[PDB]
Amino acid sequence: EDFEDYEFD
Amino acid sequence: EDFEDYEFD
Amino acid sequence: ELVMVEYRYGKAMPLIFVGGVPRSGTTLMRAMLDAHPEVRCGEETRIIPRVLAMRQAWSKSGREKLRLDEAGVTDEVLDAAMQAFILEVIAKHGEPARVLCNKDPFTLKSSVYLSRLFPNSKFLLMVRDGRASVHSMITRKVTIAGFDLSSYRDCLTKWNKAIEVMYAQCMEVGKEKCLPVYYEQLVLHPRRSLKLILDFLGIAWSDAVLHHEDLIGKPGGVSLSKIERSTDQVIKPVNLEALSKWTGHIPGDVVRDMAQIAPMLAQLGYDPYANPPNYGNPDPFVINNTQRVLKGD
Amino acid sequence: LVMVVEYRYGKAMPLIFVGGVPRSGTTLMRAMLDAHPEVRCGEETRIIPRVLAMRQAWSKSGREKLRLDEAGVTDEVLDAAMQAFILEVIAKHGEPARVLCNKDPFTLKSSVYLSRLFPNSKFLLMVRDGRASVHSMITRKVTIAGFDLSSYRDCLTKWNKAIEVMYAQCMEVGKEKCLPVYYEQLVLHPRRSLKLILDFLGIAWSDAVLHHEDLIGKPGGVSLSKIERSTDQVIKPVNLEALSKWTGHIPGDVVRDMAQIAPMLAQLGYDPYANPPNYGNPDPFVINNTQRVLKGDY
Ligand SMILES: Nc1ncnc2c1ncn2[C@@H]1O[C@H](COP(=O)(O)O)[C@@H](OP(=O)(O)O)[C@H]1O
């Protein structure tokens, strides 16, 4: 996916 | 540390 | 202060930020708050933690900060920009309420910053046994950029670091403004827990917080996204099913090295060599809820 | 909303956005605008292009837009958050002025979106001969994400794609809202250029626009970052030295293939087979400025 379920640093 | 004069183009 | 009884959103607003490492009861917590008629949290915005990470990132990076400061884009300007972006998103992504709330797990890595930006905000830091949180993300494939789901060791190491930061931030914010909420205590003792939480928040009791599942899809109630990974758990009343499903699924080498991989376990009151800890005794209310869940209500 | 005289700012204010490919006279342009008493642009914010790229990516992904929509984070919410963020940065990062301006070169890749966020904003797209911009970035080592400074061929190819997009955006926004400004014509003819520019912007003529070098560091004047790459050029009056200096420094194979490498040159009126083109003849005003620079006044 272009973006995961979550992220931060 | 990917510092550049222009970082988004 | 801009339009949303006509509530105004502004930086001095009463706000609640809920967070924690994903798979720690954050959706349950926010849904229980949503059940209250004076509070709206709503769905994860996804974008708030991205702008925070962006903000937090180049303060260490010497070169970016120097360039920003020379451009007049100082802390004061950035902070003003961040406040405005965040308020717009929190205010406009759901229904208005007297007390607005945001739940995005990783925002709690920035509670010291958020507390400064929003001087009347409060924080609920969800704490769950890291073995339960890790087993959840691995078995359900809930993806976190930077966490390797093919490794219990990796996920536990990254859980540990994540909660170490969030807890340190919660302690710095202080007892008046940030409350650790333990997932297992929330589940075992919902009434006692919510009473303590609502007191901390300065918000009066409502039985509705103990019947969140009845307010799903309803006005002033609990709005759930069908794509969010916790939705099919949160449609059920508070129940005991997820407390210790992890037991027996941790690789032996990781079980051996548990206190060293995850020193935050013991620091938060979880015995790293109990498989599982005795989290406590369930209230009859949650025993009953669990029985209803099992029969298939 | 208010900047400390009492200036208001908001969504509907007539913002000026300056940009183009870097090394195209964008700092000169915004500096001449800063010299105007009613206008403030100030330094490159960096954070505006960054947040624009982030927001673009969020809607570009089908799945991510679906997730955001399901969260109540719709185009309308995102756009409101973007407007408020962008205005805070523009308003607060420099001195207050009646007319607010921003120069971050690659924001002009987003002029359609920006014009929608800010319905009274206008755009100045700096256009310079790509051979001059590319020679500039290579010889001075101005780093631009994805450009390989060891290759004129690569840098011209990427200049070409970048200006292609910005120029299409400019055309889409329309002649009322975006004006291409030719750097070589600004330099040769700054009086006439600024006359046309100020008129397009609906701002009254001021002579100070032709004297930006006297307003560096001054209140209501031109604020420069000491670490931006154009600063040591911009502290001088408009002068002729930089127009054609690229000529003879382009590798022979690239000169030969110029028309294939950078078809945007011909489209913009730069003859790709002239080394260099005749850009024109300078006003006495610029000849005199150039002479003062060579005498070492700056
Ligand atoms: N009604 C309920 N009762 C008990 N736990 C619940 C619940 N609804 C959600 N949870 C728990 O919250 C966890 C996810 O937390 P988060 O929302 O922060 O990702 C899930 O753990 P499991 O995946 O182990 O079941 C889930 O079961």
Ligand SMILES: Nc1ncnc2c1ncn2[C@@H]1O[C@H](COP(=O)(O)O)[C@@H](OP(=O)(O)O)[C@H]1O
């Ligand atoms: N006072 C002035 N007169 C003429 N050109 C100027 C100028 N100040 C800056 N420029 C030109 O603007 C170019 C940089 O553009 P930008 O600000 O968009 O990066 C530089 O080109 P060179 O590097 O070829 O000298 C610079 O010489």
